[PDB]
Amino acid sequence: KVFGRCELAAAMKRHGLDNYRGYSLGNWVCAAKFESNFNTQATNRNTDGSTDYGILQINSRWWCNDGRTPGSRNLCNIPCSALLSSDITASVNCAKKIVSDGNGMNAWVAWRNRCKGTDVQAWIRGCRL
Ligand SMILES: [Cl-]
Ligand SMILES: [Cl-]
Ligand SMILES: [Cl-]
Ligand SMILES: [Cl-]
Ligand SMILES: [Cl-]
Ligand SMILES: [Cl-]
Ligand SMILES: [Cl-]
Ligand code: NA
């Protein structure tokens, strides 16, 4: 599923991301835009052979099981395919564990490089939330 900007903002708000660990909704929408272009089915293979999955490009080296990442962990206790669903619940619940993990949103390289220090509130401007 490819979300609309405001649709995703509404979905992330209903799932508790709004100011989660102090990150305003626009931060998460900005991260989704640059990680996946709001496409739940986005995958990207890493040089180390891990794979990123879903709207927030969550990686198989730590967070989910794809059965092809030797010596990896499954800290969110989910099959990586769950992160590709039109239901963002698995993506949001796993994101809450990642963002709690000491580095906050710096864990998403595209958030640090493209959203941090920008006017992220622009990403939710004109949405009914
Ligand atoms: Cl957009
Ligand atoms: Cl915001
Ligand atoms: Cl594995
Ligand atoms: Cl594990
Ligand atoms: Cl599994
Ligand atoms: Cl949803
Ligand atoms: Cl933080
Ligand atoms: Na894994």
DSSP string, 46-93: -TTS-EEETTTTEETTTS-B-S-STT---TT-SBGGGGGSSS-HHHHH
Count Cβ atoms below 10 Å from residue 24 Cβ, excluding itself: 16
Q: Which residues does residue 39 pair with via DSSP β-bridges, in sequence order?
A: 2
- CATH number for the domain spanning 51: value is 1.10.530.10
Give the C-alpha separation, 29 to 64, whole Å.
22
Could you tell me if residue 61 is inside a domain?
yes
**Which residue range is the domain that position 38 belongs to?**
5-124
Please state the residue numbers annotated as binding site for substrate.
101
Which residues, by Cβ under 5 Å, contact ligand 2, an ion? 24-26, 121
The strand pair at 58-59 and 51-53 is best described as antiparallel
Number of domains in the chain: 1
